[PDB]
Ligand binder design. Structure first.
Ligand SMILES: [Zn+2]
Ligand SMILES: [Zn+2]
Ligand SMILES: [Zn+2]
Ligand SMILES: [Zn+2]
Lengths: 148, 139, 138, 142
């Protein structure tokens, strides 16, 4: 079956759940996880719940986990298809990081957006020039898409 | 009168036998206590063995006890297989991200792991043998 | 190790944008905000020396919940006379197209489009008289 | 009549004595079995002890100073030594003490140091304090 590490992390997720984050294994794919992240406190996403999916590739942990939002969200570092701009998912990935580090980092990205990112949306531009409006729109989208 | 004397002697012998039996029972109880103590002692060395096992010798990449342990210039260690795979993508320590300048096999780590694992269950010993074979096939 | 539907489709999205081969088939998301990655636009350049030549065919490719374990649904938008394609609706009959009838989870939108283009070169298709260029089904 | 009565009583006493003897024999057999079990337990215990005293003494002890490695360094030839010990050696010779291959590299080993600290932590406070003294003594040297 799975490498010991994947077994280790998978059962650590069930036994020791990350605060504000649910992560359940898929019913058919032992490397596939359905994640729900609670909107971080004092964020415009607070009160919302956001679906994410996580996949552990063959070459994991040499290769980074794959993660994507499945809930529409207004955020400079999440695009229209839910793809996440996070450097530890590409550039700064190392086998010591683990799954829950990624998940907490994603949560932290919600808590503190990075509009100044080079490969940022277009939402970023609104976030840079009119941060107040962007934050209200983030809250608007949370109401619209992340409350059910 | 002679019969009475014989009966008295028999009674005395019976009493002596009873005393001997009691002494034997006490000895048996002491032996049982010693056995229990030995069992407790046997239980502890296994904990002292599972100490290095889980906590010190595991490769951070694969979470297995190191298989052909190698130590980098930055003083961190990994399985030879794991670091060799990592270095196909990044020439930096997975732990501290320092540039890798040297990779050195460690006989002491390997011998310590091999010697300790040899005392654990068949299941644990066999998994290691399988992993070595699998990694070998990979090579 | 099976790659989940959504991550496989993300792969196909990236491949579509990068393009493959000689660009005679192409594919992309129909709706660039469709997070379900379900509805795709397919394009086939009609192959030379057939009655399909010099025509661009647009298609709709639907990747359902069980994709790629299960084949996608395919229909031509551009009108075409071709065996396996319903003449009035453009719907591709899976049973009549080998890549769909004998679907494997190693296949992809790319493979489906390349197969349809290959089948356009078949003896029984290449000579079929075609409807006027530019017509589409409803 | 009290004659045959006395004789009957004597016979009963003899029977009781025989029963007691049989019980004693059974107890002795049980004791022997217990002793055998204890011996088996001791044998089972022994292997771990031997493994520990060729763990700690043969893999963990520096060949130059006969102490558990202090600031373990591993050479290109895969042998390890205390940092202090191998540096003093290298002022005089550039061949591994153990295999005599020319020394081409040294690296410290966090895993070996951490493993040793954990192991030594389970030893007597004499052994633990001796190690502390050497660490500081060879730090003063530094
Ligand atoms: Zn490893
Ligand atoms: Zn390092
Ligand atoms: Zn030494
Ligand atoms: Zn040597």
């Amino acid at each position: 079956g799975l490498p010991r590490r994947i077994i280790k992390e998978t059962q650590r997720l069930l036994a020791e759940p990350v605060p504000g984050i649910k992560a359940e294994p898929d019913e058919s794919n032992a490397r596939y996880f359905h994640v729900v992240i609670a909107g971080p406190q004092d964020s415009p996403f607070e009160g919302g719940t956001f679906k994410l999916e996580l996949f552990l590739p063959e070459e994991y942990p040499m290769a980074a986990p794959k993660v994507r939002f499945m809930t529409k969200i207004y955020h400079p570092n999440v695009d229209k298809l839910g793809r996440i701009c996070l450097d530890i998912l590409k550039d700064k990935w190392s086998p010591a990081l683990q799954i829950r580090t990624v998940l907490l980092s994603i949560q932290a990205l919600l808590s503190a957006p990075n509009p100044d990112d080079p490969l940022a949306n277009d939402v970023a531009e609104q976030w840079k020039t009119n941060e107040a409006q962007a934050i209200e729109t983030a809250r608007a989208w949370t109401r619209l898409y992340a409350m059910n | 009168q002679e019969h009475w004397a014989l009966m008295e002697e028999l009674n005395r012998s019976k009493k002596d036998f009873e005393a001997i039996i009691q002494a034997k029972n006490k000895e048996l109880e002491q032996t049982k206590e010693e056995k229990e103590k030995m069992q407790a002692q046997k239980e502890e060395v296994l904990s002292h063995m599972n100490d290095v096992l889980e906590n010190e010798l595991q490769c951070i990449i694969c979470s297995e006890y190191f298989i052909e342990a190698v130590t980098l210039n930055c003083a961190h260690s990994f399985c030879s297989y794991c670091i060799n795979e990592w270095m196909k993508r990044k020439i930096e320590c997975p732990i501290c991200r320092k540039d890798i300048k040297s990779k050195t096999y460690s006989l002491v780590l390997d011998n310590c792991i091999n010697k300790m694992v040899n005392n654990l269950s068949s299941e644990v010993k066999e998994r290691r043998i399988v992993l070595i074979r699998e990694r070998k096939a990979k090579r | 190790v099976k790659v989940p539907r959504n991550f496989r489709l993300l792969e196909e999205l990236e491949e579509g944008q990068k393009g493959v081969g000689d660009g005679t088939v192409s594919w992309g998301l129909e709706d660039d905000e469709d997070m379900t990655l379900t509805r795709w636009t397919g394009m086939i350049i009609g192959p030379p020396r057939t009655n399909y030549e010099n025509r661009i065919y647009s298609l709709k490719v639907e990747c359902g919940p069980k994709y790629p374990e299960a084949p996608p649904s395919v229909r031509f938008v551009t009108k075409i006379n071709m065996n396996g394609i319903n003449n009035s609706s453009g719907m591709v009959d899976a049973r009549s197209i080998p890549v769909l009838a004998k679907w494997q989870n190693s296949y992809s939108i790319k493979v489906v489009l390349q197969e349809l283009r290959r089948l356009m070169m078949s003896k029984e298709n290449m000579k079929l008289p075609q409807p006027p260029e530019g017509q589409t089904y409803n």
